[PDB]
Ligand SMILES: Nc1nc2c(ncn2[C@@H]2O[C@H](COP(=O)(O)OP(=O)(O)NP(=O)(O)O)[C@@H](O)[C@H]2O)c(=O)[nH]1
Ligand SMILES: Nc1nc2c(ncn2[C@@H]2O[C@H](COP(=O)(O)OP(=O)(O)NP(=O)(O)O)[C@@H](O)[C@H]2O)c(=O)[nH]1
Ligand SMILES: [K+]
């Protein structure tokens with residue numbers, strides 16, 4: 244991008260960069276239009292103001308004691324929960340995990356291993372146990388121990404699978420049954436490599452269980468995570484953290500200005 | 509024939525209108541390029557493809573035709589079917605077979621290894637699974653459990669085990685048990701992680717696989733071109749598996765990956781279950797991308 248030169252050529256370049264970042268046609272067009280109609284010639288900081296502003300629709304404080312973690316298969320839910328245990332134990336919080344993926348091969352054992360590495364206790368059942376009943380029991384356990392935070396892992400599910408989205412809904416009600424205030428956080432995990440489907444994922448999970456935040460993983464890769472733009476524009480859901488690796492420390496609270504700088508880089 | 513909303517409008521607005529201006533043609537091709545990008549086709553690949561369509565349509569006299577909607581649509585469809593492979597094609601197996609499953613973190617490799625084990629078991633081959641991912645927690649157990657489910661043995665690689673040691677244990681189990689299809693499940697890795705890409709290339713050099721399958725998630729966006737190019741240049745890819753096609757992602761990453769590699773998309777993953785494997789049909793994906 245030639246930040247200085249011919250407006251019409253600076254905007255052609257910006258369009259390309261946004262499209263290559265997975266911003267998508269609709270959001271890219273709207274950004275470009277809004278900037279054109281603004282009359283502004285300082286295109287660099289008009290575009291930057293716009294993007295940083297929309298991505299805000301500093302330590303992250305959960306609004307309650309139970310965080311429910313959701314998303315499609317393979318996006319990084321289990322690993323992110325491990326990183327959230329590390330993040331919050333560093334802040335002197337008493338953290339418990341619920342291995343609520345009782346469906347996939349080694350889905351519970353996987354989070355258990357992380358629990359052992361991190362000295363965080365993990366509520367598990369045998370494969371096939373009802374994840375909603377397990378979440379209920381996990382919440383009761385967290386209350387009884389006086390713990391600060393419980394992270395509820397869930398099986399990966401495609402947002403197109405209607406009944407599996409109903410299962411997620413039951414999990415949420417089961418949490419609320421054990422503790423009426425909960426869950427005060429429902430965080431979608433999105434893989435940064437995802438294209439336009441990320442918007443549909445976000446829409447459908449929001450519809451099902453009502454998101455209070457998004458975590459974008461795998462932002463250490465070459466992908467920019469650009470579909471966050473239409474997600475936040477459309478759903479007004481704040482971005483909480485970014486995942487930048489496979490270790491328990493590889494989590495950063497979301498920084499809109501640095502994200503935007505990276506997106507256009 | 510119903511297309512995506514965007515293409516229905518772009519093609520539909522041309523219908524019954526006789527010959528169209530060069531500006532209406534240019535307008536139509538721009539909309540095709542945008543549709544492809546909406547479908548997660550890499551922007552450069554999209555530009556390249558619509559240049560190929562423009563030239564083909566012009567050789568079919570699109571600007572003299574009284575039915576240019578028909579000429580354009582036919583050109584686009586047939587070009588997309590062709591660029592995706594033309595017809596279904598499966599691997600050709602030899603007397604002995606050793607394959608790698610490679611790709612990004614979370615794409616579907618471990619599950620795909622087990623699906624292939626079941627598919628070929630049913631065709632009277634004798635598979636062996638190799639759990640070669642020693643970095644992801646419970647990766648070995650994950651494949652062991654899937655092997656048990658599909659009734660196929662699983663060799664689990666040890667922490668720190670050298671490629672040469674792996675090779676010896678694998679060839680010996682395959683000898684003792686007369687296993688003719690060996691499926692090596694590798695850890696997910698970034699295409700820019702030079703140490704891990706180097707590791708993978710050194711496992712390939714030692715093990716000598718006949719096939720190296722890039723497992724690509726259907727929801728993958730613009731980076732599919734870069735990822736496929738890198739796995740191909742750094743390791744060598746012989747074919748692709750497109751996973752999670754039971755979702756609603758359009759699957760345009762398959763066009764990016766096939767464009768830059770020229771390699772066949774062999775299989776489609778269509779559920780989370782061992783049975784959720786089908787041959788890939790380029791005509792089917794062509795329709796999915798175009799919103800048939
Ligand atoms: N490079 C990188 N890899 C990540 C990041 N977050 C998660 N991963 C990786 O992505 C893969 C999938 O992670 P996992 O936590 O199993 O995802 P999941 O959403 O729980 N999967 P499932 O739906 O099967 O339960 C793992 O290999 C893991 O190490 C990240 O920020 N960067
Ligand atoms: N719906 C659906 N889910 C799939 C398909 N293929 C794999 N999965 C799912 O996607 C998730 C990731 O699969 P997995 O085999 O762990 O992926 P991986 O590439 O081996 N991950 P890693 O890089 O960490 O080793 C699992 O939850 C699995 O059940 C598919 O075709 N359809
Ligand atoms: K990045």
Ligand SMILES: [Mg+2]
Nearest residue numbers: 320321344350
């Ligand atoms: Mg998981």
Ligand SMILES: [Mg+2]
Nearest residue numbers: 617618641696
């Ligand atoms: Mg795996």
